[model samples]
Target: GIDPNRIVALEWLPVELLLALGIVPYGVADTINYRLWVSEPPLPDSVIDVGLRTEPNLELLTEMKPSFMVWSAGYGPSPEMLARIAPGRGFNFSDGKQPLAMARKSLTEMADLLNLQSAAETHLAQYEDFIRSMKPRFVKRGARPLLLTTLIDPRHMLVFGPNSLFQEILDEYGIPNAWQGETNFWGSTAVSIDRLAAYKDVDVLCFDHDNSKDMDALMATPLWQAMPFVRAGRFQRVPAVWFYGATLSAMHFVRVLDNAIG
Candidate 1:
């Protein structure tokens, strides 16, 4: 029998998946940062921190005797290395296409591994219902075309674009994303403030934390002040949502957007 409590999550996405399946992983990598960034399906206080995602503590893993482990595809520890501690699997993320589908599939795979397929189905059903119910709210809100971004510094911002979970969700709801430029495989691009000048009459929704390092400085600049969104008072900030997360993160983002636009 598969025991969910014995599983270890080596990446934030895997942790989210485990929580969504109603399991608290035996151990997680970078739990502190995961709490800050991922924020949803909160990690339990009892779960052990297995060290950094890129370099988990092997000695600790051996001590915990994890039944299995999961990690992000193409990142962090190699499967061979993890297998020595415990048998492991890796999950894939966005490939610049069908990210939403990929997320659902990854969650499904995790459920199958943990014998939680029924729970996974239930969660997915609720996800669809929520998306359907929320679509009308956006339409009623008369939502503006939005540029989803987060400040890197005074001069640059990370803009969500193609293959991003954010963009895919926006597309599903028939809302337009203002950014239509090149993006990395993970679906965001860091561009200077000048690139933002090309868009007009669009709201800029910045994902941020309470103590964002560069937000104050970014807002103080003449370049930022010159933005149409800034001039029109269309720029807004909301609590941070993990842009690279799975189903739980997607739902969290939708809720954040609903609250932000309201």
Candidate 2:
């Protein structure tokens, strides 16, 4: 039988990828408790939750004796620490630098580590074909919707900037990101509620919807209600696929957008 406690993931994207490929890790970081920037399905009962923003439960980790530890570039071992734990292999999701490419490459690397190369190749090929076919269809439509993925905070809102994996996906679909402001490595830019009104012409407004209850309440606020997009019925609630890192799950998000916009 496969050992249920033999794997550990440091971030949600990698965990989500492993789960998508049918390999549920023994332990995953509790990123949700800290920053609810992304939305995903409820954690499976089998996944042990190690607290985030610090070292995982080293004692418990030692007890689990994970044969494989998967981490994204944003959450990997420090050089000195890497020498100490000496994990067999590490998967860096940020290395690809582009979302679609990262998805393909990360899956290939992960498949190699898990000894499922053939399956990974097949899945990557299929996804590539799907993307190719869809690209032209959108392009032929003459104009695509301007897309933006944002986090609406009580004080202000944060928008995704260029060179992000999300931006890459939008570029592939020939869509424009409404916000042109600068952003950090995480692709986040903070703006006041008043600045949001400037995007009145935006075609689509996509934001995280994990805690739907909280989001609903936020939407009810006068500032949000006054937004032209909301008034025009162009606001869209989408799952948070990868707010911090890129993974194969992004392809699933692409599929969702394809359907949503069609």
Candidate 3:
């Protein structure tokens, strides 16, 4: 019998894509704290929850003996630790530096990992067909709304700036990012509550959070309400699929935008 929950993922984006592709892992990192953003169904009772950040329960991991282990390269896991519990090979997806290309490459790599490259290709073709079909609609509509404002540190209020993967996604969708300033590889820039007034006219203010508490706080903020987009009901909170760990979830993110702005 093929166990849908045999794969293990240390990050949400890859996990979301794996689940969306109809493959569940045997064990997954606990992401309950950020469920609002990632959009994953409740973790099944049968799946084991490996704690995040710190090492997973080694005994449980060895017992589960996952067929494949996936993690983000951006996180801290010593090489020795990985060598001990390695599942033949590992997938490191921290390519948010190059969104679109990395997305395509990640999909291909995932398919190859599962020995389903051909099947994955067919699926990719279907996704392409869907996009092609939507092209005319987008052309008529002009362009989708740009998404600025990603959550780097809730307290700090960091956001996406120029030349990041998030920006690249906006560009591909023909949307203009409101923040075109400087940012790190994570595409984050710390800003004060008062500074947000500068982007009042931004079409869409995307808040990527791991928890609802932050969303609630954002909603309560006077500065947030002052933004035209917020008053106009254009502010949206989406899952943190790849706030810092871009993986196959980019596919799901694009799909959501296709539906949201289509």
Residue 30 accuracy (lDDT) in model 2 = 72
Candidate 2 steric clashes: 0
Best by lDDT: 1
Q: Rate the local accuracy (lDDT) of all candidates.
A: 0.82, 0.63, 0.59
Q: Write the per-residue lDDT of candidate 3 for residues 13-85, one digit (tens) a residue.
A: 4565465355666677765653655553455666668767356666777777776676655554564585577
Candidate 1 — which residues are off by over 4 angstroms? 141-143
User: Per-residue lDDT of 170-246 in model 1, one digit per residue for the tens?
Assistant: 87776788887888878899999888877778878888755466787877778788887788888888878888778
- List pairs with backbone clashes in candidate 2: none
- Give the Cα RMSD of candidate 2: 3.7
Strongest candidate by TM-score: 1
Worst 10 residues of 2 by lDDT: 79-88
What ranking of all candidate models by TM-score puts the best one first?
Answer: 1, 2, 3
Candidate 2 runs further than 4 Å off: 1-5, 31-44, 53-55, 76-79, 82-90, 95-97, 136-145, 245-247
RMSD for each of the candidates: 1.7, 3.7, 3.9
lDDT of 2 by residue, 1-262 (tens): 1343476776666676565556777777774552355455446676777657256666666666676666666455453553354263455545434554665677776766777677776766776676667785466544535656665556566676665666777777778777677876556677776677777656664656455666666677898899888787777876555565544555656766676664
Which lDDT value does model 2 have at 222?
Answer: 96
TM-score of each: 0.94, 0.79, 0.76
